[PDB]
Design an enzyme around this catalytic site. Structure first.
Site, PDB file in Angstrom:
ATOM      1  CD  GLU A 171      -1.558  -2.315   1.705  1.00  0.00           C
ATOM      2  OE1 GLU A 171      -0.599  -2.373   2.017  1.00  0.00           O
ATOM      3  OE2 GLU A 171      -2.468  -3.303   1.716  1.00  0.00           O
ATOM      4  CG  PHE A 222      -9.257  -9.508  12.272  1.00  0.00           C
ATOM      5  CD1 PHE A 222      -7.870 -10.029  12.661  1.00  0.00           C
ATOM      6  CD2 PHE A 222      -9.817  -9.595  11.291  1.00  0.00           C
ATOM      7  CE1 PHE A 222      -7.305 -10.652  11.700  1.00  0.00           C
ATOM      8  CE2 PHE A 222      -9.002 -10.296  10.184  1.00  0.00           C
ATOM      9  CZ  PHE A 222      -7.725 -10.726  10.345  1.00  0.00           C
ATOM     10  CD  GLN A 223      -6.614  -7.423   8.787  1.00  0.00           C
ATOM     11  OE1 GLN A 223      -7.685  -7.606   8.027  1.00  0.00           O
ATOM     12  NE2 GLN A 223      -5.504  -7.666   8.380  1.00  0.00           N
ATOM     13  CE  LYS A 251     -17.389  -7.016   5.848  1.00  0.00           C
ATOM     14  NZ  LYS A 251     -17.193  -8.434   6.337  1.00  0.00           N
ATOM     15  CG  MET A 272      22.390  12.990   1.391  1.00  0.00           C
ATOM     16  SD  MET A 272      21.080  14.116   0.542  1.00  0.00           S
ATOM     17  CE  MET A 272      21.959  14.784  -0.735  1.00  0.00           C
TER      18      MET A 272
END
Ligand code: FAD
Ligand code: FAD
Ligand code: FAD
Ligand code: H4V
Ligand code: H4V
Ligand code: TP9
Ligand code: TP9
Ligand code: K
Ligand code: K
Ligand code: MG
Ligand code: MG
Lengths: 593, 593, 215
Positions: free
Chosen positions: B57, B119-120, B169, B488
């Site tokens: 993602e 959950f999640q 959801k 760098m």
């Protein structure tokens, strides 16, 4: 006498280095950048700990989690400001949900630039507030030892979890000029009555069950005392995903894993138990099924004064959070078990209860459709093969996973026997966890066999860290279950969305050429006749190795307790149902799937 | 009449799909998961927009940023709850710092599970608060169209930036049962006086300079009006990193880029200018040098009533934030330029000023040590080669970068001529940006040549997204400047830490085998004699292609204004100094570097 | 105004910078801005079936019943129809006519010992717009043991009519949660509830407790 001047003349970075030593840190996972340079300069060529360099700070974070779960020590992360710090946010949220002691040190722009939208400035204290137990920005070098002590203490006490300490570059470059309190340079009757009450309840129980989770793993004596209780009072034992390995699953008293994808025997038993002894587990929603329908025999027994739920929990936040405890026993579960067990009556036999337990175990194995001539390898079979072959080396075996069907099949089909051998993202469920967690676990336990059972999609997330394994000398074993799909999501799409597979098939690289490019040994198993020898080659390797296995696609994980259903209202595997499902999927997708 | 019932009977997911259409979204970047399934089901096989699937993602987020910067449209991201959402945090922080319109839609656990450590479940509204302009959790389907409108409006107005809309959801699965306000189903004298005052000031100026940044790119007429002003009043033009391409650098009035690694001519000019016209630029600390010593001639002129700083800025937060504006002209810089220019006197010549400007340009080229017989390719030479050859196709050329020395050399040594052709992480400075940003830019501009000038370390961060380019049909061109170092950071360690290279050499994969594994064309340039033909093969390719170039190591980016120094107190390239530095580095590292 | 007055009512704050309130509107604005379930239906039916089994019901009524003008009327209609004694919280005082013989007065820390005794012995508790605050429940683990037992045995429990999901299953587990405005949901509920003429044993206890426990 109470003041210490031994740090005077040191930079904040040098003080950081010395405090790592005092905290017995032997490994740091991290990645350099401008704001954190004074600390990197201080730890330059340090022989006091191993430094592990990932390719991405998310990698450092998950490595540190794998390290912590394997070792029982805090995982230490050292990253730069801005994107270095924001890249550790998923691992912090992950550590928070799974109770993992993570101590994250992030560089920050100088105090003179904070709040100016400075070069590489992120408000990481604001951003990470919700995904840490605690965080702080150090504002001067004199308080740096104190904040480091506080971080390690908070990370490792109560329910373990992540903390973050933000380090402005001018603080870590500055030199301590003043002495500091010497303490900062160095690292109940109520419960007693509850334990007695809890023991009196268990001594009445006719259908007891132990529900054990991660908390029992947080003391080395935990699994021993769990076994001592189960043996003494003759109690069957189920565990969560995170408790796997807390109980020897070869014991006849083992009910295996409970929950959404746990054994229907375990789920049946907890639904019928009159007394549930919850040992370091938080009743998460993957385990309870429909909460209002959870544990009805235990609730009835509580009402009738002959059972209920005995919850041994260290964090008050998680007591009476989801389900009402009949007795709440606050504090470290292992210490409280030492008081509890002597009050518990020894029980020789429970004929009627174990007669039911044994019939349920016989009735509810982890069944699935076996291979047929010409078919692809079934993923359930692969896991059994790895588990059987791994168990034959004279080495500890630690398993990490990605997230999805492969993770559940790993949970079901390995035989779990030792604590801290299942290292998996449970609460947050982060795809990509498996590989970096394995590197961290392998660094923690250099003599262990460490196997990342990974999904193809999950693996794709963080595959760059293969180079990190090589550079760290971590001979991890990655097994990619290649079903060419995000299987867990396609399982839900088959079941609830009429086989409408919306964006759940990512293209995969050639995993053998990928391994080669990363200087990792590669093995590919494409058919049934290569399974045994390919898995042996995988386990026999003494270098990092990537095994790809081609496995059957569009296969559901069963049993399954669907959303909204009681724990004992599960879907079971059925050969004919699977055949019909395949035909329906084929018709609906015009033969594509 | 004011109420609309046309959405009644639709799910939240279906409503989402319809609102994307109404907002003219033609591309969505995202990745599925359990909480966001009702939305994925609604957009299943949609022919209304292109869906782009990354491997991570973070990839979706940076792709959407690349898309937005190339197209001038908002980049839309669609991810699941928990780790899907926390994985977009770095791209959101990135978009916030660089003013990139990003609209992030994250799935969330059902409203009935929020706050239960579900959950999640991540508190993404809490976590992303500091790295968005605005965010919201949708609580019912009736407000979903309104929140989507609000998100797009906030993302794209004022200073553009990221917003996040959290989608439980059960909301996206629920069906709209009630009509909703029809407006929700569809997408000054004070300043006028300031403009007049500002014009009177510019009409007195004898040493004017335009300091132009990203804001001028936010209107299609911006660069045209910038040129019209510079032409009319005869003013030299410098730009920031983010303004590159706003002004045709082939124009004699071009001073090139200013700042820490900008042209010493530009830095000298702004330090000596009596009037600074700041057009859509925020005086960030990479540009100003030591703030108290910044622009002393402009401050003196302001005090004496004959010049100063004229700041055209859309966000009040950034007016008088760093430097005091003599006149603040609030609002869109392009619209305000339309009012301003007619009040500004036409100037035919500025002999003394341009005599200085021309001597500074001659005195301060971007000099460096050229190749010698047998030496590796110099990275400065490589960039010039790519720039010269790219400019010869009949196609637009868009450049993205990673972060580090290669990024600065890309900025210095390309010739920038067109708006929205430099797509680079400036404010946050996120390594790993280059590849996914290129995929997003390539999707936005399918007929463009899109070149990711990347560092090896940067590339390692997100290399998995090579598969995503192939799957999306995006024929991006990745050039990895392989100096086998985090250049760098080693530059800073050479300069400030006595050549103590603390953990700044990550091991690289075999980039040619990596490309092969990803189904991408691979080219490797290892010596000077392969440079021209290898770069031609790279640019001529009509498929995704990875070019690896072996380049000289331990080479500093110059000029350089070190921390604490005035903008005109810069380090310049010197051949003898470089030789001595090499000898010192060799002695100090026992010949290792 | 919408947020303040919907769901559970509560306070909102709108901050007004002086330059905004001194500034003059120069542009038109959307005209809408210039002007001011099967799941629950099944829960109501289930809740009614539970109440129709109850032998010792009690209504526990609070502030939420005051938030509809028809609230007290429907409360009385239910108590009359199914012959149920009524206790209220401090904030529900006046929702039920305390002169009615069915009134148990206020429950809680300083409430009537008759009301407290009744709710501890009830097999079915109908919670109408009340949040089980800690001044009312006493020791939570020892609260309402007869209702919890009845829930376990499938013959009673707690029927919670609550508009804010935050306050459902927050303190005590509801046997049935009936989400939304309590007055509207009472209109659906009451017709499903059986009319009861007498409850001799229960009201015999209720009446002895009232006599035994005056203030
Ligand atoms: C796809 C997927 C499917 C899943 N399905 C299942 C499933 O079917 N079954 C299953 O079990 N899990 C499943 N999970 C995992 C689930 O989401 C949780 O992560 C897991 O159940 C939590 O287990 P736990 O309670 O033992 O551990 P934790 O979440 O870590 O909770 C441990 C508890 O013990 C407490 N504790 C910690 N230390 C101590 C101590 N020293 N003394 C006392 N108490 C302590 C903690 O405070 C906490 O309350 C699944 C995950 C995924 C990604
Ligand atoms: C390694 C490294 C080195 C760097 N060195 C340099 C360097 O030497 N030189 C350099 O320039 N940068 C350098 N940077 C980048 C620097 O950090 C900033 O990102 C950059 O200078 C910001 O440029 P900007 O002000 O034009 O753009 P922004 O940061 O986007 O600011 C744009 C400003 O214009 C305003 N604006 C936006 N839209 C409008 C509009 N329509 N009308 C009016 N105003 C508007 C915005 O509100 C904002 O205040 C470096 C970055 C890195 C990673
Ligand atoms: C010194 C002192 C002693 C006290 N002792 C007692 C005592 O002994 N007994 C006692 O009762 N109180 C006592 N209290 C008061 C106690 O603290 C609470 O304020 C009170 O019990 C709350 O009553 P309630 O639940 O009816 O109202 P609220 O706290 O307002 O809760 C109302 C509930 O109904 C819901 N609701 C609102 N509107 C609707 C609607 N339209 N439909 C459905 N639901 C709705 C709300 O969301 C909320 O959950 C005492 C207070 C003090 C200061
Ligand atoms: C990381 O940036 C900062 O910490 C900072 C931010 C705002 C103001 C001052 C500063 S600073 O302490 O001076 N340090 C730098 O600037 N460091 C820096 N390092 C590199 I490597 C590279 C680089 O620039 C490319 N800068
Ligand atoms: C993503 O999880 C949630 O959104 C959630 C969280 C807490 C409670 C209920 C829920 S839920 O709406 O029922 N949905 C699920 O559970 N979904 C789910 N999906 C998969 I793919 C997989 C999976 O389990 C592996 N679950
Ligand atoms: C998309 C997704 N879950 C949503 C999701 C999205 N993004 C992240 C970072 N994590 C998760 N858990 C899953 S489980 C698919 C996993 O696919 P896999 O790694 O190939 O495993 P498998 O096919 O065995 O189920
Ligand atoms: C570590 C670092 N910066 C700190 C850092 C850390 N982590 C992230 C995500 N981003 C940044 N910017 C740099 S610029 C090194 C870049 O190395 P490179 O990609 O090989 O480029 P180069 O060698 O050309 O400088
Ligand atoms: K097992
Ligand atoms: K140039
Ligand atoms: Mg898969
Ligand atoms: Mg490099």
């Amino acid at each position: 006498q109470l003041m210490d001047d031994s740090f005077i003349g040191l930079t904040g970075g040098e003080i950081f280095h010395e405090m790592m030593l005092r905290h017995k840190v032997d490994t740091v996972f991290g990645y350099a950048g401008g704001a954190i340079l004074p600390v990197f300069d201080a730890i330059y060529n340090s022989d006091k700990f191993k430094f592990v360099l990932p390719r991405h700070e998310q990698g450092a974070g998950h490595m540190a989690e794998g390290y912590a779960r394997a070792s029982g020590k805090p995982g230490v992360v050292l990253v730069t400001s801005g994107p270095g710090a924001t890249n550790v946010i998923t691992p912090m949220a992950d550590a928070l949900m799974d109770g993992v002691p993570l101590v994250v040190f992030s560089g920050q722009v100088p105090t003179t630039a904070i709040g100016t939208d400075a070069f590489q400035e992120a408000d990481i204290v604001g951003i990470s507030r919700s995904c840490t137990k605690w965080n702080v920005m150090v504002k001067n070098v004199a308080e740096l030892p104190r904040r480091i002590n506080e971080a390690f203490e908070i990370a490792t006490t109560g329910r373990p979890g992540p903390v973050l300490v933000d380090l402005p570059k001018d603080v870590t470059a500055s030199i301590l000029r003043e002495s500091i309190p010497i303490n900062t340079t160095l690292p109940s009757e109520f419960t007693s009555e509850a334990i007695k009450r809890a023991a009196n309840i268990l001594n009445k129980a006719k259908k007891p069950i132990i529900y054990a989770g991660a908390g029992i793993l947080n003391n080395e004596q935990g699994p021993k005392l769990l076994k001592e209780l189960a043996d003494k009072a003759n109690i069957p034992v189920t565990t969560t995903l995170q408790g796997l390995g807390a109980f020897d699953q070869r014991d006849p008293k083992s009910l295996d894993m409970l929950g959404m994808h746990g054994s229907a025997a375990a789920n049946t038993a907890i639904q019928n138990a009159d007394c549930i002894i919850a040992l370091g587990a938080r009743f998460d929603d993957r385990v309870t099924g429909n909460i209002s329908k959870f544990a009805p025999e235990a609730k009835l027994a509580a009402s009738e004064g002959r059972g209920g739920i005995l919850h041994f929990e260290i964090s008050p936040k998680n007591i009476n959070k989801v389900v009402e405890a009949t007795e709440a026993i606050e504090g470290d579960v292992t210490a409280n078990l030492q008081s509890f067990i002597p009050l518990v009556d020894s029980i020789e036999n429970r004929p009627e209860w174990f007669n039911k337990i044994n019939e349920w175990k016989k009735k509810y194995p982890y069944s699935y459709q076996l291979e047929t001539p010409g078919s692809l390898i079934k993923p359930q079979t692969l896991i059994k093969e790895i588990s059987d072959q791994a168990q034959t080396y004279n080495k500890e075996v630690i398993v990490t996973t990605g997230v999805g069907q492969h993770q559940m099949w790993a949970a079901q089909h390995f035989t779990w026997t030792q604590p801290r051998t299942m290292i998996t993202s449970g609460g947050l469920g982060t795809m990509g966890y498996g590989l970096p967690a394995a590197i961290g676990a392998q660094v923690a336990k250099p003599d262990a066999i460490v196997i990342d059972i990974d999904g193809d999609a999950s693996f794709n997330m963080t595959l760059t860290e293969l180079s990190s394994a090589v550079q760290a000398g971590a001979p991890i074993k990655v097994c990619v279950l290649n079903n060419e799909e995000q299987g867990m999501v396609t399982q839900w799409q088959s079941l609830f969305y009429e086989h409408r597979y919306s964006h759940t098939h990512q293209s995969n690289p050639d995993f053998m050429k990928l391994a080669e490019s990363m200087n990792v040994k590669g093995i590919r198993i494409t058919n049934q006749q290569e399974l045994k020898s390919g898995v042996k080659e995988f386990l026999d390797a003494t270098e990092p190795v990537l095994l790809e296995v081609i496995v059957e696609k569009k296969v559901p994980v069963l049993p399954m307790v669907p959303a909204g259903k009681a724990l004992d209202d599960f879907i079971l595997w059925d050969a004919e149902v699977e055949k019909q499902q395949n035909d329906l999927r084929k018709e609906r997708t015009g033969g594509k799937y």
